[PDB]
Curated annotation (Swiss-Prot), chain A:
It comes from the Bacteria. This is Renalase. The keyword Nucleotide-binding applies. The lineage of its organism: Bacteria, Pseudomonadati, Pseudomonadota, Gammaproteobacteria, Pseudomonadales. It comes from Pseudomonas savastanoi pv. phaseolicola (strain 1448A / Race 6). GO terms for molecular function: FAD binding; NAD binding; NADP binding; oxidoreductase activity, acting on NAD(P)H, oxygen as acceptor. It holds the Pfam family Amino_oxidase.
Amino acid sequence: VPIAIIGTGIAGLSAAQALTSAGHQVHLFDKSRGSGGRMSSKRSDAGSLDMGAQYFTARDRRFATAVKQWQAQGHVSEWTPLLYNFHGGRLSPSPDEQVRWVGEPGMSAITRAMRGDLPVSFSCRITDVFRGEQHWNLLDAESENHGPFSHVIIATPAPQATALLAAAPKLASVVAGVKMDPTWAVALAFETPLQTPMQGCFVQDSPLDWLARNRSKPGRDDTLDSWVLHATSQWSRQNLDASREQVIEHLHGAFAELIDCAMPAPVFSLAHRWLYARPAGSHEWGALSDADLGIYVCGDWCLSGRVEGAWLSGQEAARRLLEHLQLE
Amino acid sequence: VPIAIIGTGIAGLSAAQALTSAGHQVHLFDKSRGSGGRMSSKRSDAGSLDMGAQYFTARDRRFATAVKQWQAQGHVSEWTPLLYNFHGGRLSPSPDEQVRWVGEPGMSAITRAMRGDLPVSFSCRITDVFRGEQHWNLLDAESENHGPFSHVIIATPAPQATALLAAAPKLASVVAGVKMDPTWAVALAFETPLQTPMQGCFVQDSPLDWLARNRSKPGRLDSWVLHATSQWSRQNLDASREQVIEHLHGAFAELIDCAMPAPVFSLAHRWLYARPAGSHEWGALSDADLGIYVCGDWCLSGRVEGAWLSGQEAARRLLEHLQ
Ligand SMILES: Cc1cc2nc3c(=O)[nH]c(=O)nc-3n(C[C@H](O)[C@H](O)[C@H](O)COP(=O)(O)OP(=O)(O)OC[C@H]3O[C@@H](n4cnc5c(N)ncnc54)[C@H](O)[C@@H]3O)c2cc1C
Ligand SMILES: Cc1cc2nc3c(=O)[nH]c(=O)nc-3n(C[C@H](O)[C@H](O)[C@H](O)COP(=O)(O)OP(=O)(O)OC[C@H]3O[C@@H](n4cnc5c(N)ncnc54)[C@H](O)[C@@H]3O)c2cc1C
Ligand SMILES: NC(=O)c1ccc[n+]([C@@H]2O[C@H](COP(=O)([O-])OP(=O)(O)OC[C@H]3O[C@@H](n4cnc5c(N)ncnc54)[C@H](O)[C@@H]3O)[C@@H](O)[C@H]2O)c1
């Protein structure tokens, strides 16, 4: 009887890896058509786009060790863009010297490799998690039952987890208090490359706080010069219900204010709203659990709100489950 | 810019009635193909079956007037069944002078009439509720946006409300604490009427705690609706429909006091969040400054009356705040 994992972002897949390494079968669920969550890459008319996390850093040694394995396997590489800063309405080079990692050929490659051939049900939105006398069961949005499962790991943003925790109301109440902040992201592509050496920019005093040039990322070689623009959470909140076209227009404007070359009209534009982009604050929980009941909860919001945090959180959920088994 | 109401059970529709009576536009949402929620009737080979709420009492003077209005409209009538008890393993009559009401021709008639031609989006599961600087917005399970809305009323079972309250995490945490119990229901119909005078029964010491005979209701094959206890329903929460029918049919066959042949049709329905485990005294929950309101039976007594009163209270708080 396998363990159900709801969510195939890096937290859920990190838990899946740990459990399967320890000799336990899992079954993965995601409402999306594929895995990766906020690390996903989007195929588009302008090539593959990373519209969520663009890169990540690694400080914790356990996570850094995993990243170096992924690198050896060809799924991640360092990204060292020629960076600029825009502050006080002025553009300047930024000798930032920080190691940043990017999935290759796209950010989604990391989680795709973690998932491997583990059993998975995509386009399967779980709406209820409930237990009988012996086993756990999942109900999906089409009213189909899934189970039996021996345990459940919920690996979703906290607001999306609360509805799945009716069986564990003390946990549900904790999870319901975890605030996550929104982000609007925009992608623009140009038929000919912009005539600038800029490959990324940190932005202040602007609707934007970050932008990146996709062709500068390792293994990227799309004919179209695509750029991904990230709005601040404050701007995104203020504009949370703006239309996609207005968001595109405004962040395009912010980009045009800082750029150091001519910018023709884009041939493609996309906006994406992440309602629950990152946690508003940090925790040191690692995971949340009711091991006696058999329910575990994980995600970036259990720790630092970054890819590293999500991965560590999944490791911790799995560790607790495995410890409980070993003890039983 | 209208008010969004998520949930078209009697709580949501009660809120809708109060708001539209006061001249405010609404838009209704439900994940189901129709309205009524836990009062809904199931169409079947034996006529409309009330698989959910079976009858209701009207004690509160305001609700009683509403019930009298519905009666005037031909949507409800008094139900005066010959009631029994199954106690100590024996069936005996249990008379009482309690007035009970039923929708006619089915329990669903009440909410259908409340809904009328109000704007509604069915097969529309709301997954997210969020606000900009001036308006509310809804996202559904197909990733389609809905809005702008001036306010939002959530009118769902409490565990289903928690996901819709991210914008109001203090309310979400309260709502997350509300326990609701499950109920399995089974319907059986017989080609010839069972030779018993019983028309309903309160049942003890059984998987069942209630059974009712539909042809005994005003305006309605001899079909019977069986309701399992919350304990039994919990113990069997992940049983198949076929297993539940088999087991609850067996339980009915154990208590009946006349010959009972094989039924010509059977149906089962699992209500995961059938009723609140306990009582509450909230009336409604709200953050009026934010513009979000929450209602449902679980805000009061866990009965039709409680749902109706809760919707009225949510609407009243909204209307009071508009000022
Ligand atoms: C715009 C943006 C920029 C970012 N930049 C950075 C950065 O520079 N550095 C960094 O370290 N991090 C960054 N992040 C954060 C990083 O993306 C996240 O911390 C991490 O990816 C979260 O992983 P997770 O597994 O916890 O959740 P997610 O990736 O959100 O995975 C949750 C999964 O659960 C699924 N799901 C949800 N509800 C259900 C349901 N009911 N049924 C089935 N499936 C469900 C979802 O579809 C999703 O696939 C960024 C995020 C965003 C959005
Ligand atoms: C088996 C059973 C027997 C009962 N018997 C009796 C009785 O004899 N007497 C009595 O007084 N009461 C009885 N009740 C209780 C009565 O049915 C309820 O108190 C009442 O109908 C609840 O109304 P409500 O509007 O609060 O919720 P509901 O009727 O549950 O309506 C909620 C609505 O919200 C919708 N919804 C939920 N989530 C979403 C979403 N995310 N997006 C869109 N729509 C959504 C649902 O589809 C549903 O239509 C019984 C209930 C059950 C289950
Ligand atoms: N199936 C479910 O899970 C569920 C969910 C929500 C509400 N409800 C029902 O709401 C119903 C209505 O409660 P109410 O107070 O409005 O109506 P009511 O006064 O008819 O019923 C209340 C309770 O009183 C008892 N009772 C009343 N008359 C009786 C008699 N003649 N013999 C034996 N017992 C008798 C029963 O135990 C009954 O459950 C309850 O009966 C309850 O079953 C059921």
